[PDB]
C-alpha cells in the first residue's frame, strides 16, 4: 500500500481493474454499469496486523474508503444516494477482501 501525507495510519492500495458486477435486477445492473466510475477503484486500510481478523479489517477498510471517497465526492459538488452507497459498499467490500488477502499474504511472508 502507498503512504502519503496524513493518512493517520492508513495506506492506499493499488488501483484494481473494475470488476463486472451484477446486482440481481435490471434497473440496478444498468445503474451500476453507468455509475460504477463514481466509486473507488482502490481502497484505504490500516496495516493488516492491526486487526483481529478479515472481517474487522474489511469492515474498517470499507468505512474509511467510503467515508474518504464521500468527502472528495462532496468537495466536487456531487452526492451519493442510498443506491450509490449500497453499491459502493459492495464493490469496496470486494476490493477490501482482495486487499486483505494480498496484505495478509505479505504478513505471512515475513
Amino acid at each position, epitope marked *: 500500500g502507498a503512504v502519503v501525507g496524513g493518512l493517520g495510519g492508513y495506506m492506499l492500495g493499488s488501483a484494481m481493474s473494475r470488476p463486472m*458486477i*451484477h*446486482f*440481481g*435486477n*435490471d*434497473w*440496478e*445492473d444498468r445503474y451500476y454499469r453507468e455509475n460504477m466510475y463514481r466509486y473507488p477503484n482502490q481502497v484505504y486500510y490500516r496495516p493488516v496486523d492491526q486487526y483481529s481478523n478479515q472481517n474487522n479489517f474489511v469492515h474498517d477498510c470499507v468505512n474509511i474508503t467510503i467515508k474518504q471517497h464521500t468527502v472528495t465526492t462532496t468537495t466536487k459538488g456531487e452526492n451519493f444516494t442510498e443506491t450509490d452507497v449500497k453499491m459502493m459498499e*459492495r464493490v469496496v*467490500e*470486494q476490493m477490501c*477482501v482482495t486487499q486483505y488477502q494480498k496484505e495478509s499474504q505479505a504478513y505471512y511472508d515475513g
Partner: antibody, heavy 119, light 108 residues
C-alpha cells in the same frame, strides 16, 4: 446442460431450523445469481431471497430477513438456504433457481424441497 | 413494491383453442416480466423472458407481448400439456414479485 439439485423432503420440528441445499452443475457457478422461492400447498410463488455466488451479496424479501439465511459454497457449486424457528407457516416447497447472465428470468429451477414442520 | 395482478385467476380452455392471459404491474417495469409454467407437482419452467423473448426448447405456440405495465402471455393452440398454473414475475427492481397465478383448466 445446467442442473440444480435439491433434496426432496425435510421433516422438521416446530422451533427447529433447517438448511436446504441447491447443488448447481453444467456452468460457471459464480457467473449467475441463484434465487429461492417458497410455495405453500395450493398457493402461489413467493420470492424469499437471492444470492450472487461471486461474493455472496444477497437480497431478501423483507419478510424473510431474519428468517432465511442465504449462502453458497463455491467449491461445491452449492447454494444454501437456512430457515430458522420453523412453524406450520413454513410448511412448503422451496425452490432454488438460476437466472441468465446479466438477465433475470429464472432460467433453471431445482425440483424443490418439500418442508413439513410437525412434532 | 411492484404488485403483479394476473387475470383471470382461472381460465377454462378447450384443446386447440388460442388463449391469452394477462399480467399487469402496479408500476412501469419496461419489458422486465417473465412467465413461468407450473404443471401439477412440478417446478416452474421459464416459457417467455423479457415480455416477448422465446426460450430454447419451449414450443413456438408460446409468445408474449407488452411493455410498461400490461403484459400478455398467449398460447397459439392450447394442448393438454399446457394445463398448468402460469405465473409472471418482475425483475426490474427489488423485491422480486410474482403474480398470483392463472390456472388453466380444461373446459368440458
Amino acid at each position: 446442460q445446467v442442473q440444480l439439485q435439491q433434496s426432496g423432503t425435510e421433516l422438521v420440528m416446530p422451533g427447529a431450523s433447517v438448511k436446504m441445499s441447491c447443488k448447481a452443475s453444467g456452468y460457471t457457478f459464480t457467473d449467475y445469481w441463484m434465487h429461492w422461492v417458497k410455495q405453500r400447498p395450493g398457493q402461489g410463488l413467493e420470492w424469499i431471497g437471492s444470492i450472487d455466488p461471486s461474493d455472496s451479496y444477497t437480497s431478501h424479501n423483507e419478510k424473510f430477513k431474519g428468517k432465511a439465511t442465504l449462502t453458497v459454497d463455491e467449491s461445491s457449486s452449492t447454494a444454501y438456504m437456512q430457515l430458522s424457528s420453523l412453524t406450520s407457516e413454513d410448511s412448503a416447497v422451496y425452490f432454488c433457481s438460476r437466472s441468465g447472465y446479466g438477465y433475470y428470468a429464472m432460467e433453471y429451477w431445482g425440483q424443490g424441497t418439500s418442508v413439513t414442520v410437525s412434532s | 413494491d411492484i404488485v403483479l395482478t394476473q387475470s383471470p385467476a382461472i381460465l377454462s380452455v378447450s384443446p386447440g383453442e388460442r388463449v391469452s392471459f394477462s399480467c399487469r404491474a402496479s408500476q412501469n417495469i419496461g419489458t422486465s416480466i417473465h412467465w413461468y409454467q407450473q404443471r401439477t407437482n412440478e417446478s416452474p419452467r421459464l416459457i417467455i423472458k423479457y415480455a416477448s423473448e422465446s426460450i430454447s426448447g419451449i414450443p413456438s405456440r408460446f409468445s408474449g407481448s407488452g411493455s410498461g405495465t400490461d403484459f400478455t402471455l398467449s398460447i397459439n393452440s392450447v394442448e393438454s400439456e399446457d394445463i398448468a398454473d402460469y405465473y409472471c414475475q418482475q425483475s426490474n427492481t427489488w423485491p422480486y414479485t410474482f403474480g398470483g397465478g392463472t390456472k388453466l383448466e380444461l373446459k368440458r
